[PDB]
Every structure is written in C-alpha cells, then in structure tokens.
Amino acid sequence: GGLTLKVVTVLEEPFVMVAENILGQPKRYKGFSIDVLDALAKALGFKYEIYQAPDGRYGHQLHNTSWNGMIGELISKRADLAISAITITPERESVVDFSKRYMDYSVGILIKKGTPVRTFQDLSKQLEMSYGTVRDSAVYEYFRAKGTNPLEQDSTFAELWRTISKNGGADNCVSNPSEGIRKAKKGNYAFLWDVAVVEYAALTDDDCSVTVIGNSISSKGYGIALQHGSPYRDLFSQRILELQDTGDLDVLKQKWWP
C-alpha cells in the first residue's frame, strides 16, 4: 500500500552519501537530506527509489533551453523529486516547483583558528591573509554582483571582490571546494563557500585547526524540487514546516553537523 516516488539525487556531504553496499547490489543512501526524506515518507506514507543524476549535476540551462542534471530529470518527468543540497533560486524556480526550505543556506569563511576575524567586513579589512572562492561558481558570481554594486552601504564587498577577482580570479581562487578547504587548512588562506559544506569540513578536521565564520550573506534555503505543477509540493511544504516547528529538523541537523 501507498505510492512509490522516484527520487533523483547527487552525493553531497553530509546531505546525501552512499551507505553500506556489496558491489553489484543496489545502493543505499544516508545523510541529512535522506533523514528528512524518510521523515516526509513516514508523514505522507509513501515509498521511494533513489538514483543519482546520470551526469552528477544539479543542473543548468543549456543553449537549447533544455536543462541537464537533476532539474532536467524533473522537467523531463523522469523523476518525481530531487533532493540533495539544492538551493532555491529564481532560475530553478522558473522551471520546477520547490518545497519550503528545510534548512538555510549561506556563504561563510573557512579560516584557521586564532585570527581576529568574525565578519566579512573584518576579512575585507585584513592585510596578511589572502582569500577567495571557487572560480566561476555561483558564489563567485555572487561576490561579483555584490562587489560591483555602487548602492552598497559600505566598502566591504567591493574590497572582497577586488581580492577575489585578482588577475581574472587566477591568483586567489581555487578550482573546487577540496582545494579551497585544504588551502585554508594550510594556514594562509580563507575559503569562502557554502556554510554547510565548509562547516562539515571543519567539524571533521583531524587537527581541529579551522573554524567557520558564518555571517549569513547570500542567504537562501535548501529545498526539495518537484515537477512543475506537482500535486505533492504543498504537502511536502506543510510537512516540512511542521517538522521545523516540532523540533525534528534541529535534531537531524545536530545529527549530521555534530
């Protein structure tokens, strides 16, 4: 009894990960997004089968107006749900329907302990520490937008962008989150990136040498993406609000970010 939904996902520590497996058998999944999905499956009484996006991509719009990745899996109706660390953005909202957020998203600073930095303003005033983000990423473009905005109340973001975009972004940016995390652990670099990812990187650091400055900029939300016009989006949203208000979301959050 009950419906089964096909869920497309992408591996993203600690949201979605591969659980125990024997080579050749179907893959199980674990993580914060998986626990949320299980809570919603219990609340709404449905089963689900997970598969990873064939291209391992969240998705982008192609020149022919089609989308790849998970979003493409939703538009093509090959998936009923998409869940991982999907930020709720206008670009995506135009082609798929999102549930209400079950966690907040923002950009934060991975940096070694002991520095006198607590805000992005502070970081923008520093002299001895280089800093940057992933080249040609949504975060990079966010700092581009904020840095070229003359309506900015103060100079913080123009400075941040001046350092980030140095020499076309070659000097101070990295190629992927691993390079930035490790470079910040190396001691003379601050890595600006997703607060959740970076925070997991700090919590699991063996040397306990880094910390996350989360000043809550570029604040969006992680949501569940469904097909446009899906009849389940409202149920998912309401159930998420009720999990948020009952205390379960904070328990799972503390579970995967100990």
| Cα separation, 188 vs 131, whole angstroms | 9
Chain position carrying tokens 């893959």: 27
Q: Which of 226, 181, 141, 224 is nearest to 13 (CA)?
A: 181
Q: Which amino acid is at 107?
A: V
Closest CA to 204 of 230, 231, 176, 185: 185
Residue type, 227: Q
Question: Vertex 219, ends 214 and 220: CA angle to 5°?
Answer: 135
Alpha helices in the chain, H assignment, sequence order: 32-44, 69-75, 90-93, 120-125, 138-147, 156-164, 177-185, 195-203, 233-246, 248-256
Beta bridge partners of 211: 111
Rounded Cα–Cα distance for residues 235 and 238 (Å): 5
Structure resolution, Å:
2.6
The whole-angstrom separation of Cα 115 and Cα 65 is 46
Q: For residue 190, give the nearest of 118, 239, 251 by alpha carbon.
A: 118
Pairing mode, strands 103-112 and 189-194: antiparallel
Residue 152 exposure: Cα atoms within 13 Å on the Cβ side: 17
Q: Quick check: helix, strand or coil at residue 37?
A: helix
Which are the contacts of 134, defined by CB distance < 8 A and separation ≥ 6? 140, 173, 174, 175, 176, 177, 180, 193
Domain holding 192, by residue range, is 104-219
Alpha carbon dihedral 192, 198, 204, 210, in 10-degree steps, equals 30
152 and 146 in contact (C-beta within 8 Å)? Answer: yes
The H or E element that residue 235 is part of is helix 233-246
Tokens describing residue 116: 């006198």
Q: How many CB atoms lie within 10 A of CB 207?
A: 8
| Binding site members for Ca(2+) | 93, 96-97, 205, 207, 209
Query: Can you tell me the distance from the alpha carbon of 33 to that of 84, in angstroms, rounded to the nearest whole number?
Result: 6
Tokens of 198: 């970076």
Q: Are 196 and 108 contacting, i.e. CB atoms less than 8 angstroms apart? A: no
Fill in the DSSP letter of residue 63.
T
- Contacts for 143-147: CB closer than 8 Å, 24+ residues apart: 143/192, 146/217
Q: What's the longest Cα–Cα distance across the chain?
A: 63
Residue at 204: amino acid letter: T
230 closest CA partner among 44, 32, 103: 44
C-beta of residue 4 within 8 angstroms of C-beta of residue 213? no
- Annotated binding-site positions: 93, 96-97, 205, 207, 209
CATH number at residue 196: 3.40.190.10
Q: Which method was used?
A: X-ray
Q: Left (φ > 0), alpha (ψ -120 to 50) or beta: where does 77 sit? A: left
Quickly tell me which residue has 């995390």 as its tokens: 181
**DSSP bridge partners of 18:** 29
